[PDB]
């Protein structure tokens, strides 16, 4: 009775929101983008092939100055590279061999790692002793940690497999804020440039927008058919691209609160692992389980290019803060730089 | 330039050399040690096996010292039953130790183990890694069959036509009926294994009991056979 009444109310509000969504769909993105000129083809070339990792590379991240990067391996090593000269700066041994995410703080001072060990670990790079030592370890989450990002040197956002997201303050070490709205594992999350908002995509074929200060879900974006493996903001912070296992990448915009473009090809059965944008927001890159990276031009959903230098699943793909290069790390223990 | 930056680059190369010299050593350490998964459907004596081979965090790691060969065994706990995402982290393990309770006739928990084993066998990124199958908790298997209170015909309609394999090696003091049912559960797992061609993947059934202690030796031989089978496939041959 009461459960059925609640279900009917949820259904009727869902119908109202669907009608509202359809009301604002005056014209699709295809019509407005038909006029602009296509970019043609982009021939991206490999410059540095970073070697020194034994097991698969599962996560990587760039610095603020687009010089130093971090890669994590399921071998239990966190290697901090300098892509310019292909030296390695810091081979951090990991307490747990299994790692699934790494992050660079936006000051060059701390790095963050996490994985199946259920504990996110912060390592300090500016130790007076000169030896890299673990600073803090946070163990609030129950499910395996999926990804982590830094707001500043003091606050860290973590997304784990317990269908919850958490915001921690490093000094006090306890969960400052919690986010419980998802019905499945929260696979990825991305942060707006203004850092006031962040959107997390989960395995419920849904993404959710959260505000860090207030700690409530603003809008929910649905429309995918499988688990969203990755998601990244637009450079302007007013749109986001989500890639799932249904072999289609979608583009959503916050203000219309609905999808806009449906990048897909009929010959693509393989899924998507990671997505990212360039500085201008024109070119977007998306990794694939079939060991290649397809680059879709701007908006017309035409394959601008293919990057097929890898042998196994590409797991991480990241564009530098100044847009000089794109770094792709795959499961063949090889991390490559393309431009 | 060379006036000011040359020393910085030289120091960076020295740091690279030190890091590489460390990487050689832990590379030897990593490649020398083998790794195994411990997977359990539920109530199949996984903790019993852990205690037998022994001689909050979500992953617990155990060490072996068998025949001067180092083994690491990883179990999964405090993680939700949705395992379609973190199972992909384990495509580099030597083998996945699948522990199944044979007393399963969830009313039919055995079918849950069979369906899960199908997912592991046919998974895209678990095709290379082999699975060691431990039919476990047979101590009461003979008891219920001898008692005859519960039937596997109701939960498995294809047992009645099934006959005892000719190439069977029953243990002494075992009833003929339990021996036939012992190999029926094995053949259900084997039917899944042999259905798929492309022999990069193989299954290793092994009956087990709580009283047994030599489960070290059965794992050691399986890891011996798995690694050499992979070497055979490289050199054409098998």
């Amino acid at each position, epitope marked *: 009775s009461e459960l059925d009444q609640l279900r009917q109310e949820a259904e009727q509000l869902k119908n109202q929101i669907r009608d509202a969504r359809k009301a604002c769909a005056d014209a699709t993105l295809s019509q407005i983008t038909n006029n602009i000129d296509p970019v043609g083809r982009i021939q991206m070339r490999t410059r540095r092939t970073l070697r020194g990792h034994l097991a698969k590379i599962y996560a990587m991240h760039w610095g603020t100055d687009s010089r130093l990067l971090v890669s994590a391996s399921q071998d239990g090593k966190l290697i901090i590279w300098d892509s310019y000269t292909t030296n390695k700066v810091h081979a951090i041994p990991l307490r747990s061999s299994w790692v699934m995410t790494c992050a660079y703080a936006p000051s060059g001072n701390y790095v963050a790692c996490g994985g199946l060990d259920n504990i996110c670990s912060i390592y300090n790079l500016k130790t007076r002793e000169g030896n890299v030592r673990v600073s803090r370890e946070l163990a609030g989450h129950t499910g395996y940690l999926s990804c982590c990002r830094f707001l500043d040197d003091n606050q860290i956002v973590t997304s784990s497999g317990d269908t919850t997201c958490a915001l921690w303050d490093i000094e006090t070490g306890q969960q400052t804020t919690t986010f419980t709205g998802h*019905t499945g594992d929260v696979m990825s999350l991305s942060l707006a440039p203004d850092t006031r908002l962040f959107v997390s995509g989960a395995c419920d074929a849904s993404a959710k927008l959260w505000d860090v200060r207030e700690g409530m879900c603003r809008q929910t974006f649905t429309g995918h*058919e499988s688990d969203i493996n990755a998601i990244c903001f637009f450079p302007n912070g007013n749109a986001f691209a989500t890639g799932s296992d249904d072999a289609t990448c979608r583009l959503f915009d916050l203000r219309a609160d609905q999808e806009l473009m449906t990048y897909s090809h009929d010959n693509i059965i393989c899924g998507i692992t990671s997505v990212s944008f360039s500085k201008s927001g024109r070119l977007l890159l998306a990794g694939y389980d079939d060991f290649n990276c397809n680059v879709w031009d701007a908006l017309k959903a035409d394959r601008a290019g293919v990057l097929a230098g890898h042998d196994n699943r590409v797991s991480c793909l990241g564009v530098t803060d100044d847009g000089m290069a794109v770094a792709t790390g795959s499961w063949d223990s090889f991390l490559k730089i393309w431009n | 330039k060379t006036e000011d930056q040359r020393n910085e680059e030289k120091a960076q190369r020295e740091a690279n050399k030190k890091i590489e010299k460390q990487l050689q050593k832990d590379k030897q350490v990593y490649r020398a040690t083998h790794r195994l998964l411990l997977l359990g459907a539920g109530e199949s004596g996984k903790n019993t096996i852990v205690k037998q081979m022994r001689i909050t965090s979500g992953i617990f790691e155990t060490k072996f010292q068998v025949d001067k060969v180092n083994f690491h065994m990883f179990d999964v706990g405090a993680q939700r039953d*949705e395992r379609r995402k973190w199972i992909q982290c384990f495509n580099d393990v030597t083998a996945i130790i699948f522990v199944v309770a044979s007393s399963s006739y969830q009313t039919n928990r055995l*079918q*849950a183990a069979l369906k899960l084993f199908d997912s592991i066998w046919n998974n895209k990124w678990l095709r290379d890694t082999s699975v060691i199958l431990f039919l476990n908790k047979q101590d009461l298997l003979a008891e219920k069959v001898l008692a005859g209170k519960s039937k596997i015909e109701d939960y498995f*309609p294809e047992f009645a036509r099934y006959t005892t394999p000719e190439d069977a090696t029953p243990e002494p003091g075992e009833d003929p009926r339990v021996t036939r049912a012992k190999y029926f559960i094995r053949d259900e797992f084997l039917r899944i294994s042999t259905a798929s061609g492309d022999g990069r993947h193989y299954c290793y059934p092994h009956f087990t009991c709580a009283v047994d202690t030599e489960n070290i030796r059965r794992v050691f031989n399986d890891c011996r056979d798995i690694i050499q089978r992979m070497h055979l496939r490289q050199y054409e041959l098998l």
Partner: nanobody
Amino acid sequence: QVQLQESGGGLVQPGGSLRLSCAASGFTFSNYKMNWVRQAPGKGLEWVSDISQSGASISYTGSVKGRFTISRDNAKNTLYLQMNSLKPEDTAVYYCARCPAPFTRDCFDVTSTTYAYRGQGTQVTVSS
């Protein structure tokens, strides 16, 4: 939005035939693999039947073997489960589930307590 609606099922006499319908939307019915799972009272989810992408490989659990027929209408995007000669132990809450990824032989996490791609669930009761 990916939603699945289950129709049919109720208090029925034993030995009868019941048809359960799963209507799907928001995704390509052709690409994915359909499963039927049932929830007994006081017990967890147990898998019952499955139908593959094209409709060739069909498998059932032991209890429902020989009495259950699973079919799919790709044009109508409708998954039919036909039940014949029902038994008192067959009462449960049924669920039309979809495996997470398309074009994949494996089909993970269909009996978990919290699964996103599972319907609200129809109720089937068998009693005198």
